[PDB]
Design a protein around this ligand. Structure first.
Ligand code: HEM
Length: 182
């Protein structure tokens, strides 16, 4: 994944646990070769997996718990690191933002030529609810989606409930989330 993601994980950890813990995690991930992450450069996905793996061990939290926190964090972090306007242009309510998600990543795709974005499809069920379909070339990021969704609730001062109803891991085609909103 592009360095932007790894910088943000690094950032999240450092803001919450200081530079000491970060160097520990960096060490255990097998990444002391790397002085700093470069925002617009492509890294091996393994760099992120090893990062989440390490932070899990060092912090005593499960990976999935961290993916959830990171998901929330990403919504705030992107607006402060170059992407406020793009976010503002993706909608002024959660259901709208979700519809615009593939379009948003297309936009990002222009700056980031090697992007491997997720695909998201909304099937509405009422004015307060929807099925979100999440398809990816990567495994086990569904917990991140959950956090992103809550991050967006926080963004649009909107109450959301998110429940995964289908799991790649059980053998289903793709992850599906049922979502209810204010
Ligand atoms: C301006 C805001 C955003 C930017 C700049 C951005 C950019 C990115 C980038 C660079 C990646 C890594 C993909 C790669 O390197 O191949 C990514 C991944 C991802 N993004 Fe976004 N993103 C934004 C907002 C969002 C939001 C709000 C969601 C909410 C669903 C989202 C969903 C995801 C997911 C689930 C992934 C994991 C990749 C995968 O599933 O394979 N993104 N995004």
């Amino acid at each position: 994944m592009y360095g932007l993601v790894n910088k943000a994980i690094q950032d999240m950890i450092s803001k919450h646990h200081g530079e000491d813990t970060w160097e520990a995690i960096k060490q255990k991930a097998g990444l002391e070769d790397i002085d700093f992450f470069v925002g617009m450069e492509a890294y091996s996905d393994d760099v992120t997996y090893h990062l989440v793996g390490a932070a899990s061990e060092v912090l005593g939290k499960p990976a999935e718990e961290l993916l959830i926190a990171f998901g929330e964090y990403w919504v705030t972090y992107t607006s402060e690191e170059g992407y406020g306007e793009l976010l503002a242009s993706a909608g002024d309510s959660l259901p709208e933002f979700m519809e615009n998600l593939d379009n948003l990543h297309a936009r990002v795709g222009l700056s980031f030529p090697q992007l491997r974005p997720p695909a998201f499809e909304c099937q509405h069920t009422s004015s307060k609810s929807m099925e979100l379909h999440y398809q990816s070339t990567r495994c086990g990021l569904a917990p991140m989606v959950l956090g992103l969704l809550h991050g967006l609730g926080k963004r649009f001062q909107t109450k959301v409930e998110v429940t995964q109803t289908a799991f790649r891991e059980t053998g289903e085609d793709h992850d599906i989330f049922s979502i209810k909103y204010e």
